[PDB]
Structure 1
Amino acid sequence: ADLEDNMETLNDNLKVIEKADNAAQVKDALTKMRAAALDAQKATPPKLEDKSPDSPEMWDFRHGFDHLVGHIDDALKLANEGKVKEAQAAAEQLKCHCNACHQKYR
């Protein structure tokens, strides 16, 4: 529901994907990461809570989720075709995009 909830949904299911035994389990966690990322996209981070919603930082925030969802969708294609290792490495690519948004706005 709130930005913290979604942030932990991303964090949790990253672990699920790391520990998964097949690609369908990976696809499961990713689908939950997809929904958590779009929810997060709608929130206003406390760091930016004093900024215009039309401000360059507010669009940067939202566009980081666009890029994160784009990674998830490309990991899903792999996951849906049974390549568990490829899809798990796909998800590991996400981490640098997590961290990059954190540096600015966490």
Structure 2
Amino acid sequence: SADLEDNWETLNDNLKCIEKADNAAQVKDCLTKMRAAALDAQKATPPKLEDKSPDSPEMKDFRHGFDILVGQIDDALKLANEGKVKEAQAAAEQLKTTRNAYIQKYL
């Protein structure tokens, strides 16, 4: 099993994976694992919001950050499927921006 902290580390390890990958098959596995961990983290309650109602604006913001992240991952997967390996890898910068601005502030 995995908790939010575990899934966060999986997400960040596979963000590094995307940046260091050498071919389409590799980036696809990195992006797949990031997407799986993102969906699992999205269902958690982050430490700063444990006193909030589950549908509070803050929890909606937390979850929307992952919806953005998952959309960016899917966009990068499409590029990787098209053989645009370098452009797929470039999504790492924007994934970090989403991660930092939406989710990190709740940990």
- Over the matched positions of the two proteins, sequence identity in percent amounts to 89
1:76-91 aligned within 5 A: 76-91=77-92
Give the TM-score normalised by the residue count of structure 2: 0.93
Q: Note the C-alpha offset of 1:91.
A: 2.5
Structure 2 distance, partners of 1:39, 1:102, is 14
What is the root-mean-square deviation in Å for CA atoms of aligned residues?
A: 1.1
Structure 2 partner of 1:71: 72
Structure 1 partner of 2:14: 13
Provide the aligned length of Structure 1 versus Structure 2. Answer: 106
Structure 1 partner of 2:105: 104
Structure 2 partner of 1:61: 62
One-letter amino acid of the counterpart of residue 2, structure 1: D
Structure 1 partner of 2:4: 3
One-letter amino acid of the counterpart of residue 99, structure 1: N
The 1:12/1:35 distance shift into structure 2, 3 A limit, reads same
Structure 1 distance, partners of 2:10, 2:91, is 18
Q: Note the C-alpha offset of 1:46.
A: 0.9
SS at match of 1:53: coil
Q: Note the C-alpha offset of 1:101.
A: 2.0
Structure 2 distance, partners of 1:56, 1:21, is 40
Structure 2 partner of 1:42: 43
> Structure 2 stretches of 5 or more lacking a match?
none
